[PDB]
Design a protein around this motif. Structure first.
Motif, PDB file in Angstrom:
ATOM      1  N   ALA A  69     -13.463   6.931  10.629  1.00  0.00           N
ATOM      2  CA  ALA A  69     -12.911   8.035   9.854  1.00  0.00           C
ATOM      3  C   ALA A  69     -14.050   8.999   9.534  1.00  0.00           C
ATOM      4  CB  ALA A  69     -12.287   7.517   8.576  1.00  0.00           C
ATOM      5  N   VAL A  70     -13.964  10.211  10.074  1.00  0.00           N
ATOM      6  CA  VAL A  70     -14.985  11.232   9.863  1.00  0.00           C
ATOM      7  C   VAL A  70     -14.375  12.616   9.669  1.00  0.00           C
ATOM      8  CG1 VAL A  70     -16.947  10.113  10.996  1.00  0.00           C
ATOM      9  CG2 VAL A  70     -15.252  11.337  12.377  1.00  0.00           C
ATOM     10  N   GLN A 112     -12.461  16.352 -12.962  1.00  0.00           N
ATOM     11  CA  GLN A 112     -12.281  15.890 -11.591  1.00  0.00           C
ATOM     12  C   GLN A 112     -10.876  15.344 -11.352  1.00  0.00           C
ATOM     13  OE1 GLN A 112     -13.998  15.614  -8.618  1.00  0.00           O
ATOM     14  NE2 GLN A 112     -15.678  16.930  -9.327  1.00  0.00           N
ATOM     15  N   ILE A 113     -10.262  14.745 -12.373  1.00  0.00           N
ATOM     16  CA  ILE A 113      -8.910  14.200 -12.233  1.00  0.00           C
ATOM     17  C   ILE A 113      -7.909  15.333 -12.019  1.00  0.00           C
ATOM     18  CG2 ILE A 113      -7.006  12.980 -13.376  1.00  0.00           C
ATOM     19  CD1 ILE A 113      -8.994  11.237 -14.772  1.00  0.00           C
ATOM     20  N   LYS A 114      -8.083  16.427 -12.755  1.00  0.00           N
ATOM     21  CA  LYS A 114      -7.190  17.577 -12.639  1.00  0.00           C
ATOM     22  C   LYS A 114      -7.365  18.303 -11.307  1.00  0.00           C
ATOM     23  CE  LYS A 114      -7.276  18.511 -17.618  1.00  0.00           C
ATOM     24  NZ  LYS A 114      -8.015  19.214 -18.700  1.00  0.00           N
ATOM     25  N   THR A 115      -8.609  18.426 -10.850  1.00  0.00           N
ATOM     26  CA  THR A 115      -8.908  19.133  -9.608  1.00  0.00           C
ATOM     27  C   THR A 115      -8.937  18.295  -8.331  1.00  0.00           C
ATOM     28  OG1 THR A 115     -11.287  18.992 -10.093  1.00  0.00           O
ATOM     29  CG2 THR A 115     -10.140  20.995 -10.759  1.00  0.00           C
ATOM     30  N   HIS A 116      -9.242  17.010  -8.465  1.00  0.00           N
ATOM     31  CA  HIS A 116      -9.322  16.093  -7.327  1.00  0.00           C
ATOM     32  C   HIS A 116      -8.794  14.722  -7.749  1.00  0.00           C
ATOM     33  CE1 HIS A 116     -11.826  19.145  -5.549  1.00  0.00           C
ATOM     34  NE2 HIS A 116     -12.756  18.999  -6.476  1.00  0.00           N
ATOM     35  N   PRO A 117      -7.496  14.637  -8.082  1.00  0.00           N
ATOM     36  CA  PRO A 117      -6.879  13.376  -8.511  1.00  0.00           C
ATOM     37  C   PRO A 117      -7.048  12.243  -7.510  1.00  0.00           C
ATOM     38  CG  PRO A 117      -5.215  14.871  -7.715  1.00  0.00           C
ATOM     39  CD  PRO A 117      -6.475  15.681  -7.896  1.00  0.00           C
ATOM     40  N   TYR A 118      -7.180  12.596  -6.237  1.00  0.00           N
ATOM     41  CA  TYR A 118      -7.338  11.605  -5.189  1.00  0.00           C
ATOM     42  C   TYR A 118      -8.786  11.198  -4.943  1.00  0.00           C
ATOM     43  CZ  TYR A 118      -2.420  12.509  -4.318  1.00  0.00           C
ATOM     44  OH  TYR A 118      -1.060  12.639  -4.459  1.00  0.00           O
ATOM     45  N   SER A 119      -9.651  11.460  -5.917  1.00  0.00           N
ATOM     46  CA  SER A 119     -11.052  11.090  -5.786  1.00  0.00           C
ATOM     47  C   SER A 119     -11.203   9.603  -6.040  1.00  0.00           C
ATOM     48  CB  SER A 119     -11.920  11.842  -6.788  1.00  0.00           C
ATOM     49  OG  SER A 119     -13.258  11.369  -6.720  1.00  0.00           O
ATOM     50  N   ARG A 120     -12.039   8.966  -5.230  1.00  0.00           N
ATOM     51  CA  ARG A 120     -12.297   7.545  -5.376  1.00  0.00           C
ATOM     52  C   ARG A 120     -13.597   7.307  -6.145  1.00  0.00           C
ATOM     53  NH1 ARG A 120      -9.949   6.722   0.618  1.00  0.00           N
ATOM     54  NH2 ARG A 120     -11.678   8.150   1.097  1.00  0.00           N
ATOM     55  N   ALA A 121     -14.056   8.336  -6.856  1.00  0.00           N
ATOM     56  CA  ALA A 121     -15.289   8.250  -7.634  1.00  0.00           C
ATOM     57  C   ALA A 121     -15.114   8.679  -9.089  1.00  0.00           C
ATOM     58  CB  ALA A 121     -16.390   9.068  -6.974  1.00  0.00           C
ATOM     59  N   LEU A 122     -13.891   8.577  -9.598  1.00  0.00           N
ATOM     60  CA  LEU A 122     -13.594   8.925 -10.984  1.00  0.00           C
ATOM     61  C   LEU A 122     -14.124   7.772 -11.827  1.00  0.00           C
ATOM     62  CD1 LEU A 122      -9.869   9.951 -10.465  1.00  0.00           C
ATOM     63  CD2 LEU A 122     -11.844  11.484 -10.626  1.00  0.00           C
ATOM     64  N   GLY A 164       0.790  -1.216   0.000  1.00  0.00           N
ATOM     65  CA  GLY A 164       0.000   0.000   0.000  1.00  0.00           C
ATOM     66  C   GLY A 164       0.825   1.269   0.000  1.00  0.00           C
ATOM     67  N   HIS A 165       0.423   2.219  -0.832  1.00  0.00           N
ATOM     68  CA  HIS A 165       1.113   3.498  -0.915  1.00  0.00           C
ATOM     69  C   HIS A 165       0.278   4.525  -0.173  1.00  0.00           C
ATOM     70  CE1 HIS A 165      -1.500   2.930  -4.447  1.00  0.00           C
ATOM     71  NE2 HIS A 165      -0.662   1.963  -4.771  1.00  0.00           N
ATOM     72  N   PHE A 166       0.934   5.396   0.587  1.00  0.00           N
ATOM     73  CA  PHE A 166       0.220   6.420   1.341  1.00  0.00           C
ATOM     74  C   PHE A 166      -0.572   7.296   0.384  1.00  0.00           C
ATOM     75  CE2 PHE A 166      -0.389   8.872   5.215  1.00  0.00           C
ATOM     76  CZ  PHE A 166      -0.845  10.085   4.700  1.00  0.00           C
ATOM     77  N   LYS A 167      -1.837   7.532   0.711  1.00  0.00           N
ATOM     78  CA  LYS A 167      -2.697   8.349  -0.127  1.00  0.00           C
ATOM     79  C   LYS A 167      -3.645   9.195   0.712  1.00  0.00           C
ATOM     80  CE  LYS A 167      -6.203   8.153  -3.765  1.00  0.00           C
ATOM     81  NZ  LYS A 167      -7.059   7.326  -4.654  1.00  0.00           N
ATOM     82  N   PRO A 168      -3.586  10.526   0.547  1.00  0.00           N
ATOM     83  CA  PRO A 168      -4.463  11.429   1.298  1.00  0.00           C
ATOM     84  C   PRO A 168      -5.892  11.246   0.792  1.00  0.00           C
ATOM     85  CG  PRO A 168      -2.480  12.550   0.596  1.00  0.00           C
ATOM     86  CD  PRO A 168      -2.567  11.282  -0.197  1.00  0.00           C
ATOM     87  N   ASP A 169      -6.859  11.229   1.704  1.00  0.00           N
ATOM     88  CA  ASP A 169      -8.252  11.043   1.313  1.00  0.00           C
ATOM     89  C   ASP A 169      -9.161  12.205   1.720  1.00  0.00           C
ATOM     90  OD1 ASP A 169      -8.291  10.180   4.170  1.00  0.00           O
ATOM     91  OD2 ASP A 169     -10.302   9.443   3.685  1.00  0.00           O
ATOM     92  N   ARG A 170     -10.467  11.997   1.563  1.00  0.00           N
ATOM     93  CA  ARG A 170     -11.488  12.990   1.895  1.00  0.00           C
ATOM     94  C   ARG A 170     -11.425  13.493   3.340  1.00  0.00           C
ATOM     95  NH1 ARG A 170     -11.829  14.299  -2.830  1.00  0.00           N
ATOM     96  NH2 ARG A 170     -13.306  13.337  -4.300  1.00  0.00           N
ATOM     97  N   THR A 171     -10.626  12.830   4.169  1.00  0.00           N
ATOM     98  CA  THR A 171     -10.482  13.208   5.568  1.00  0.00           C
ATOM     99  C   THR A 171      -9.008  13.364   5.913  1.00  0.00           C
ATOM    100  OG1 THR A 171     -10.687  10.840   6.110  1.00  0.00           O
ATOM    101  CG2 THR A 171     -12.639  12.226   6.430  1.00  0.00           C
ATOM    102  N   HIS A 172      -8.714  14.139   6.952  1.00  0.00           N
ATOM    103  CA  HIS A 172      -7.329  14.341   7.350  1.00  0.00           C
ATOM    104  C   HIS A 172      -6.774  13.252   8.261  1.00  0.00           C
ATOM    105  CE1 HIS A 172      -4.712  17.709   6.040  1.00  0.00           C
ATOM    106  NE2 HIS A 172      -5.801  18.020   5.360  1.00  0.00           N
ATOM    107  N   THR A 173      -7.009  12.013   7.850  1.00  0.00           N
ATOM    108  CA  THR A 173      -6.532  10.821   8.534  1.00  0.00           C
ATOM    109  C   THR A 173      -6.124   9.947   7.357  1.00  0.00           C
ATOM    110  OG1 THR A 173      -8.843  10.036   8.587  1.00  0.00           O
ATOM    111  CG2 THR A 173      -7.929  10.932  10.632  1.00  0.00           C
TER     112      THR A 173
END
Lengths: 316, 316
Positions: free
Chosen positions: A315-316, B170-180, A17-26
């Motif tokens: 995660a919230v 969305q890829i350009k603005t939110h590449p870390y989106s899990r809904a692309l 697994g590679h570290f990936k920032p998500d929709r939350t700051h965790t």
């Protein structure tokens, strides 16, 4: 053992697994593209390495099968899985008269009495949804949820399509169809949805008198969500098989973004030190056959002897 | 080598595939649930074990990217992949005046001059679509095809959604989106569609500055379709990466029903005796960046040194 694919997923996410920032700051450790299969003839894939609330899985699925989108049904079963979503709408309503609650999610995990006030209002909300039919109708109805997407897909004519009902129909009449698909993804709703469906779509498949199902999950929480997600769909597979007079085949779980939250590392590590036990068995009401009319008592779980439950922050 | 996942798929279907009757009276050996990944940094996954028409793959994809649904564009590029579908509608039209053609598909492979008459009328149809703008508009427009589903999804307001355009946004603005995610599956059209989308949905994913894509294919023809299917989406991955200023990651191909037709056994067996060669490389126009405005000359394939092509009867 039957649940090894799950444990292997946990292992793999930790090693690759590679570290990936998500929709939350965790943060999260994530992987993209994974598939695991469970042979339902070997047993029911409910994790034994940790106690999972089957009752919650059962109630939520029946809610789905009923084409229900109102939280009241869940509350009537001591099931609070979707409360937050309804509460969210309630608090932001012009009728709400109580403490702020802006971003209750993030704030509850870090505040003392705030969480107590939050819990207090949530309790009121639940009681209200349970007794005031007018209230339940306005704030208890989530609207766009799995039950609605599976059984009441809105068309352009204004009518609705019972995808699941039609597919079950197709399974009985054309078991060899390669289009037994049910989608929960609607492009016109997705842009403005609190949480677009995680369980994007699934496909049934019949061969040698056995029914199998593949689920494509775009995002998954390895630790908290996956154990439930596996149970929900393995159960669905059994029910549909039960109605179509077929035996169960395999449950194939495909993932898009499979991720583990950093504040779960220690918890997943300890679970990986436990040795799986024989998988439980599932028994369904032999007389009842219309799975849509199924009730809690029609689904029995046998020989489920798990290890104690593992607690972990959400995660919230 | 890079194409091994494909060869391994062929091998597996031969060893573990169970006979399954399909939409046609030409059996298949099938498996359910499979996933393979190609590292696009290692090269372009165009089969070297047999000559595959890259030109056709390129033209069809540009057609898709343009949101085009009219066969005329394809005919203008010596690409006849979708002719049958348009022809189907033409023959069944109240304006058609020529030999019967009922079920031209099945009948062409077994009849002598019939296939010649069929080819004759098809030639006329193509010429007509190419020159009579009124004709092309009425019978050249397939309507519900990938180009329309990707770039002009019809909503309830009567408006249309450019899924792909929005996702790239969305890829350009939110590449870390899990809904692309881009779906080609519409429950309201599917019940009455000649051939519901095989390539059901795909998901993009960004990590460490690399773009990856996962495709969920509900049904696949191992021998004839898959080699094209791999190329089409690996190409798409490159183009989107090219526009979003990202490097290419992996192409993940997930299958529902992966099947091999019985009248292809010998052909797949002989291909499995060939040794893969170095994979070709893909070069894109450095100056151009709006992939939607891309043209044939903007995509170059280099060092593609394949084995001769293998001919095999189609399933109709």
């Amino acid at each position: 053992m039957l649940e090894q694919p799950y444990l292997d997923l946990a292992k793999k996410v930790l090693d690759e697994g590679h570290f990936k920032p998500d929709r939350t700051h965790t943060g999260t450790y994530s992987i993209f593209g994974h598939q695991m299969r469970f042979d339902l003839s070997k047993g029911f894939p409910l994790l034994t390495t940790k106690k999972v609330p089957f009752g919650l899985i059962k109630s939520e699925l029946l809610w789905f099968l009923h084409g229900d989108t109102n939280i009241r049904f869940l509350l009537q079963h001591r099931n609070h899985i979707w409360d937050e979503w309804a509460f969210e709408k309630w608090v932001k309503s012009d009728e709400y008269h109580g403490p702020d609650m802006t971003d209750f999610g993030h704030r509850s995990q870090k505040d003392p009495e705030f969480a107590a006030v939050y819990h207090e209002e949530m309790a009121k909300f639940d009681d209200r949804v349970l007794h005031d039919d007018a209230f339940a109708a306005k704030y208890g109805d989530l609207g766009l949820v799995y039950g609605s997407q599976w059984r009441a897909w809105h068309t352009s004519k204004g009518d609705t399509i019972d995808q699941l009902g039609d597919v079950i129909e197709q399974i009985k009449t054309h078991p060899y169809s390669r289009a037994l698909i049910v989608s929960a993804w609607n492009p016109e709703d997705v842009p403005t949805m609190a949480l677009p469906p995680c369980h994007t779509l699934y496909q049934f498949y019949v061969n040698d008198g056995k029914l199998s199902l593949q689920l494509y999950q775009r995002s998954a929480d390895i630790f908290l969500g996956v154990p439930f997600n596996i149970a929900s769909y393995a159960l669905l597979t059994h029910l549909v098989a039960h109605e179509c007079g077929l035996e169960v085949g395999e449950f194939i779980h495909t993932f898009g973004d499979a991720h583990l939250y950093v504040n779960h590392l220690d918890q997943i590590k300890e679970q990986l030190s436990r040795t799986p036990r024989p998988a439980p068995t599932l028994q369904l009401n032999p007389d009842k056959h219309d799975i849509f009319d199924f009730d809690m008592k029609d689904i029995k779980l046998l020989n489920y002897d798990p290890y104690p439950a593992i607690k972990a922050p959400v995660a919230v």
